[PDB]
Structure 1
Amino acid sequence: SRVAKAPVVVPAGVDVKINGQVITIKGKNGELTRTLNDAVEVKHADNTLTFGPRDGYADGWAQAGTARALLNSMVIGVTEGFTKKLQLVGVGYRAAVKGNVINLSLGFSHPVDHQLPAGITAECPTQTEIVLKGADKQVIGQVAADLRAYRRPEPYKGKGVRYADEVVRTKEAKK
């Protein structure tokens, strides 16, 4: 609707190939591919991407409204990248990356090892910090959630793997 009217201007240095509903986008950071819904039209006059409804579908401007913001993120990923910072709060909590494997120490009797997917590369500058980078926005959101899901941040001291941006609302251990 009000999202699907506004065009996705695709900058130079970015290759865009339309194949029916399949849309590949190649750039210097990577290449990405998504099939659209059957309710969406897509076309291109050399600078802009426009997303129209195919006539006859009731969910026209919502399926075409989703398709704009998906491809608006595919362009940013192949030319800038999406980066997600994660920290650690607590005593003895520390991280370490070996190649593509985060090794966590989070208060358990066993070690914690994570296996980073095929487009995501991780970096611990600090033992209490993870910085991970990737082209696809949906995968850096999913990788960040699986690391936070080992010690979901405590409601008493904020303790555990949290996101960098968020506020963790704390509670007093009351009586």
Structure 2
Amino acid sequence: RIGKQPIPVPAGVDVTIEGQSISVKGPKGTLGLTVAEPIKVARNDDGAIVVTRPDDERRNRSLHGLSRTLVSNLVTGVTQGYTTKMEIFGVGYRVQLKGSNLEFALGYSHPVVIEAPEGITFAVQAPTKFTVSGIDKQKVGQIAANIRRLRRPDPYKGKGVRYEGEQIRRKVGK
């Protein structure tokens, strides 16, 4: 049903097609994206991006809808940076930001200094709260996965990151 959903272009700074490959500009930095050749992509009369392919192959539909969400990700990302918020529920911890990268320490030696990637913003909201932002869900969410399971959040007391909920299990006593 997503095949019926076009993508308006609020910015359109340099949003174009260069050989089944879309280059995107807006308020933020530039983005690119390879277009699956099976799917036909064109621009609408009003500039909105139209992605289409019929069916009788299942993957045509998968690539069509997936493609729509990717283009929406490019446009909404370049016009509005994405972010993830992390709250710390533990004891003996302070978010440190020495230089330009994050240093964390909760109950173990050799505080972890996350190697920051290119094209990303980190921010501290409190000693037990911090955020991260960027222009790509694949780049921001990658750092979000490399901080968990390292010291697995015990669902008995709590000692780590929660993404504003997640219905984390609690202890059953002792």
Instruction: Give 1:138 shift.
Output: 1.6
Deviates more, 1:63-72 or 1:94-103: 94-103
Matched with 1:118 is: 118
Matched with 1:82 is: 82
Instruction: Give 1:59 shift.
Output: 1.6
Return the TM-score normalized by structure 2.
0.89
Matched with 1:103 is: 103
- Distance in 2 between residues matched to 1:154 and 1:114, nearest whole Å: 22
| Contact kept? 2:122, 2:131, Cα under 8 Å | yes
Give matches, 1:128-167, under 5 Å.
128-167=128-167
| Contact kept? 2:12, 2:24, Cα under 8 Å | no
Deviates more, 1:63-72 or 1:135-144: 135-144
| Contact kept? 2:11, 2:79, Cα under 8 Å | no
Higher strand share: 1
Deviates more, 1:83-92 or 1:39-48: 39-48
User: What one-letter code is carried by the residue in structure 2 that aligns with 1:44?
Assistant: R
Instruction: Give 1:6 shift.
Output: 0.3
User: What one-letter code is carried by the residue in structure 2 that aligns with 1:142?
Assistant: Q
Where 1:102 maps in the other structure, the secondary structure is strand
**Is the counterpart of residue 14 in structure 1 residue 31 in structure 2?**
no
Instruction: Give 1:47 shift.
Output: 2.5
Count of matched residue pairs: 173
| Contact kept? 1:106, 1:151, Cα under 8 Å | no
| Contact kept? 1:94, 1:104, Cα under 8 Å | yes
Return the TM-score normalized by structure 1.
0.89
Show CA shifts across 1:124-168 (max 9, x none): 131111111111122111111212343332210222222224321
Structure 2 alignment gaps of length 5 or more: none
Show CA shifts across 1:15-57 (max 9, x none): 2120122111111111111112222111112421111127885
Matched with 1:29 is: 28
Q: Percent identity?
A: 43
Where 1:50 maps in the other structure, the secondary structure is strand
- Alignment RMSD, CA only? 2.0
Where 2:126 maps in the other structure, the secondary structure is coil
Structure 1 alignment gaps of length 5 or more: none
